């Protein structure tokens, strides 16, 4: 009958459907096993050093997530507490970024699926706010633009293309992989809806000099009369600076910073599926972008590109915030920074590489091969795959397309034990290459 | 030291922070307990009859989800199989909608967070495809529009506003709560990037007459020369029609249907966080909308408003598809339809209500009070809250803002036992009202 | 075959049997799901503020319980250790109540299902001890009685009726909701088998003045020559006084207190199913009430109305005792008292209510509406149901039937977070009422 | 700090408190371990062949139990569904006993902790009903009595003593271990509140001839004019006869049977903590015994000696009923009967014993030693302890206090594998004895 174990049955004799949906059902145990088995050919997230996204949470947090995988977030009326936790996160992150708040005041911001959606909401606010200002002056509004560096993350290219905004990029120079504040301010014109600075480049983890950008842009504003704003893409750096570098002025402490995005699922220490965007003041979020629906129970102030979605990541974020606090996050970041140094040194000791990333910034290590003659960084990346390590290789954006680097992101769940094994295995790979 | 139970400690004496992040850490057990406890004041999803979103999956599927909550979907190179499963879902859903496919041909479509994102991608494709066509004819492209009914879901209003497209709505009439195909086709002009039909209105679960819309629009196309396309918002109906009403022509069988969206987390039987959008042919998705990145390992063809996101729902969807098959989905939908009838009858038997939803369509029941004099539907909604039921009340869109209805969505995890208890508790509520001002 | 998920099967199409037992079996997964689903229409115990019974235990204690749900307590020979733990609990509770015990002496008492059974065993001991004393003096024994306040818990009415004893009640006055010691002593006659004082009234959580009752009754005993005893119903207060108020003399420190009952599943911090009764000395438990059976293995000294029963609560009780100790229990009670104050203040701040409960006593808050004109406390109780809170309303006993109160019991698992949300939601309910007929 | 494992800490150096409650808390892990460890010196319930109480349930049922260990049953208003399930069980058991019920009429009965409480409620109803009848005739009511066999279970002795009713016992004869219907009817007088027959004696699992008792008592009723009722103590047999011997008339099919008790935690296949009592008609339960309280939310019709208690067993019972149905219970009982035969034969094959139990009745085997000279049954009981088997030895009641038997109860979780190992180990024990003084 159904007494056969899954591997004694005839279900393991058929490969999983690729094109058509099967006509008949198969036992749940069988479906679980075969899908689970093929998934083993995926890489191990914990060994995926290419990603900035968190790959480990406390078991206690796994429970909260599982207890609420069936809670659709968008059901505000049905789940009042879930909605409140989202608001509290916005408040806590807002204060974390030194937003102009009156202590018990409600912050302006929203939780998103990730920085991608956060960036596009921020962009929309900028575009609209700019359109309104111009229409009020009679001026034309057909050629909006944004100013960023060539190190800009794909999400800004998506925004530019889909929302018909021009992307003005400051090109990179050899040995200079972030956006030059000066060149950026010089590109600003009357059609610039904002200048987007990146606090933690995905290329070498460097923080851009937001304070300098603010200083120069304030000066230019006195001349041009345009009120060009700054947006800080703190996808990763947003949950690092406040704890490692509270001294660094990059946030709402700078007058021109009007909105900030940060990924909760990066250094916010949550599984993939959570991002945040904060606005300096209510005025920075045009009221006409906000919707109020009522077919689910009552009226709700929504500003998102998504609707139905899991609420587990929101809850998970709140857990991390109140469970860790400043203390916990500082400890985690310090551990990450420490491991970065350990990995950095180990690579310097071989005298085979050029460290192309900075000492401070995002906890990661980007490096190139001294003399990329007989062997390329791509070969090293492939070689490491055999050991289970996933370490990416890529070329820099113009005008540094001649520079190719390897990147290792240090996350919360990357212990010293793994760091030291990585160095050893990298050395082994270099030897295997010396004989080819 | 730390031998105190959470409720013997001093952590249960402080209320959870609302504004500022705490300076110090607190024990994991304590943080878990207090957050878990406050969450109890949330409603029970299983009793939330307001939602179309699935609130139950098999334990076996819970495991798959948990085993991959740390797999970031966007890491294509790192997780080849996760990406493949997404492709297979696109293929299977494409065939399910009778897309023009050559057996082993790869379908054109993408997985999304939900229908909201799917709709905006579909809209973008329409807008761009329209812009290109017009620019090629030297014609202007500054006033794009979309034609839908007033029963349109908020997501189309979002799209219209954010992507600067005009929303032309066909208004509702009393007793007529879907979009009239005729009036819709008459609104079509040279600037219409598409006509969006809804296969399962969130208002009364009715399927719009997509076939008629197609027939009329094909005729108008012969005259105008415009190539006005149809998009079917099958957020819910997409996973119902193929199994309950296969004969019904609403999908790619209709020549003018160029793209379809469907929510996996609705009647796709997956937890919240998964949607799909299918395109009839490659030509319907302008190539310049597609990106190819390579800073994570290699080049990948992405067309989404999101980037990093969980891959658990994608995997969960594939599980449901190959585990249930046509048979399983049919069985679930038949069970849902059956329970709808049971609830419908029970309400008819009281002769207190007007059933404002149809016999066939989305498994739900929308009804109004005969004689809304002494008591309103909103009162009934509040009353039911006491028993734990969440049943929404709302006024129809114009021109029917004088029509107020209650809606009960029947989902996969809504058994006959619950259906019958709902009828009983609704009757109890009506009596409690018969003795009030 | 059996590959269908429960919600794809035909078992969710039938409602659960109400009258007749089904002829055929159904899959275990199916039976589990449907029963589990209907149970969702039960209230959430953690939000049930009407109950004094514990609704949360440590996960470690859940394991002990599960590990022994199959251990039938009555099997003394088979489970020697389970029986010993029961004895240790009796000893520990006896000392906790300052019973006259020499070092390492075995206390006189038994574990019960709850205070209900404990009270009836205590009553039986009193009745029998009284019958014996009277029969020895040749005096009549046909009209026994007990003296308590009108605030007496139903369990004493059960005892009176089933064991044919007369219940003499001291009536309540407005603003005076406990038993007046003086009036009580005045009701005592030759047929009074005992005077039952309540240490924590279920009506306003007030402790009755047991010490005064003892003082007056000792005086009356010098006159009448009757040896009228006192029983303290410490169902809830029994696990509160020893930790919050050790100075308060209410227990065996008072000479006339002959027996005490306490509920382990109330503030003893155990799940429902455990109570205790302690006797001052061996002489207070007539030997002829004890049985010795031998059909299970050997002879055993049983004094209970029950036989077979779970032993998990007994084990759970012992766990709580040795795991928490004085320190743990004090911490839990202090937390409960603190939360009571927080809730009390929040209600005072609205100036809408009259706090009818005292500052010290059982951690709870009983309050009435100032001016019960346009709205009653019952309306507030119903309104709160919508949020998930269960807060009861009830009228006092004679002669205070004109006084209606709301009661909120603060238990171990009621954190400050919940306390503050309760205040907020109560305020919301008051506003919703300010706009009604 | 607290990094020490429990067995590396100083908590395993102190023995668990026996008399005084500890001053300080200890880590939960430590308390769990030490208590769990000492409990290992308890016998294994699954190997306890002395008990009639179920020692195993399906894992699915363990979940239901755990999900509701915090639901206090007595909270009717708070847990409506829990209360309903109790009612459904009463209905289903009532029909199972062929009670005079229409459709769909509500049965008269209540769930209890066990048969002990059920018996005392049944007794109370009898006593009261008898008192009323006599007071109406101006006759005296000071000497009530009950008629049973000497094989009567201790619970009837408890009732007799605590509720001051005289116990008239029909003595046992050698080879005759149940109550003789004739002698019983002859003992009936005007003061007999009922005759209690036992459907499954705890001594040899024999069913008493209830039908004969009814026939004789109906005749005597025609003469005496007294309306002497019958109560059937079906503690165990209640869940056996309906499935193995539906032909047997023992229940409400007999006119004189006015009430029946049965233990859910025996052959009802539930863990310890559930019993039931059914009444033939509403008239058999005097209305003045029923209480209606309202301090928890609303009025509720309670008739129990207990108050607060777990509701897990009630839910567990309902699960078993609808999950197994007639089919499941029959299968379980047939398996139990089969294993009884296997064990019976194995003992007959040794020609060392006298089978003192019958072929049909409760699935068990009671046997004595042929020639109890050099060795007693008690020695065999002790010997078996070494292997882990718990098999009791006991002497019959008068006039058979010379007969000593061993009893093996066959429960649901006693497979053929265990049955065969028992026979083997019993043979081993007999040999070990053949070589002793």
Curated annotation (Swiss-Prot), chain A:
Phenotype when the gene is knocked out: No visible phenotype, but increased glutamate levels and decreased GABA levels in the roots, and loss of GABA accumulation upon heat stress.
Biological process, per Gene Ontology: glutamate metabolic process
Cofactor: pyridoxal 5'-phosphate
This protein's record includes keyword Phosphoprotein: yes
Catalytically driven reaction(s): L-glutamate + H(+) = 4-aminobutanoate + CO2
Keyword Phosphoprotein included in the entry's annotation: yes
Regulation: Up-regulated by calmodulin binding at physiological pH.
Residues where N6-(pyridoxal phosphate)lysine is found: 266
Molecular function GO terms recorded: calmodulin binding; glutamate decarboxylase activity; molecular adaptor activity; pyridoxal phosphate binding
Function according to Swiss-Prot or TrEMBL: Catalyzes the conversion of glutamate to 4-aminobutanoate (GABA). The calmodulin-binding is calcium-dependent and it is proposed to directly or indirectly form a calcium regulated control of GABA biosynthesis.
Name used for this protein in its record: Glutamate decarboxylase 1
Lineage of the organism: Eukaryota, Viridiplantae, Streptophyta, Embryophyta, Tracheophyta
């Amino acid at each position: 009958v159904s007494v056969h174990s899954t591997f004694a049955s005839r279900y393991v004799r058929t490969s999983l459907p690729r094109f058509k949906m099967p006509e008949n059902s198969i036992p749940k145990e069988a479906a679980y096993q075969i899908i689970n088995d093929e998934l083993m050919l995926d890489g191990n997230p914990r060994l995926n050093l290419a990603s900035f996204v968190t790959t480990w949470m406390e078991p206690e947090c796994d429970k909260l997530i599982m207890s609420s995988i069936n809670k659709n977030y968008v059901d505000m009326d049905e789940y009042p507490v879930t909605t409140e936790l989202q608001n509290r996160c916005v408040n806590m992150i807002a204060h974390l970024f030194n937003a102009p708040l009156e202590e018990a005041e409600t912050a302006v911001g929203v939780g998103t699926v990730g920085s991608s959606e956060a960036i596009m909401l921020a962009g929309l606010a900028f575009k609209r706010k700019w359109q309104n200002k111009r229409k009020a002056e009679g001026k034309p509004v057909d050629k909006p633009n944004i100013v960023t560096g060539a190190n800009v993350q794909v999400c800004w290219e998506k925004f530019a293309r889909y929302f018909e905004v021009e992307l003005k990029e400051v090109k990179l120079s050899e040995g200079y992989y972030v956006m030059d504040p000066q060149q950026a301010v010089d590109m600003v014109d009357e059609n610039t809806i904002c200048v987007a600075a990146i606090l933690g480049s995905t290329l070498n983890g460097e923080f851009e000099d937001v304070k300098l950008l603010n200083d120069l842009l304030v000066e230019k504003n006195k001349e041009t009369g345009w009120d060009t704003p700054i947006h800080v893409d703190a996808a990763s750096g947003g949950f690092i600076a406040p704890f490692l570098y509270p001294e660094l002025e990059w946030d709402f402490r700078l007058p021109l910073v009007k909105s900030i995005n940060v990924s909760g699922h990066k250094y916010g220490l949550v599984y993939a599926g959570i991002g945040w965007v904060i606005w300096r003041n209510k005025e920075d979020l045009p009221e006409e972008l906000i919707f109020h629906i009522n077919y689910l129970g009552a009226d709700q102030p929504t500003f998102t590109l998504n609707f139905s979605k899991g609420s587990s990541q929101v809850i998970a974020q709140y857990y991390q915030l109140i469970r860790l606090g400043h203390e916990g996050y500082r400890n985690v970041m310090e551990n990450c920074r420490e491991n970065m140094i350990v990995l950095r040194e180990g690579l310097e000791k071989t005298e085979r590489f050029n460290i192309v990333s900075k000492d401070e910034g995002v906890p990661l290590v980007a490096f190139s091969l001294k003399d990329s003659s007989c062997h390329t960084e791509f070969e090293i990346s492939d070689m490491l795959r055999r050991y289970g390590w996933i370490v990416p290789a890529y070329t820099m954006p113009p005008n540094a397309q001649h520079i190719t680097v390897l990147r290792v992101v240090i996350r919360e769940d990357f212990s010293r034990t793994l760091a030291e094994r990585l160095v050893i295995d990298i050395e082994k790979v270099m030897r295997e290459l010396d004989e080819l």
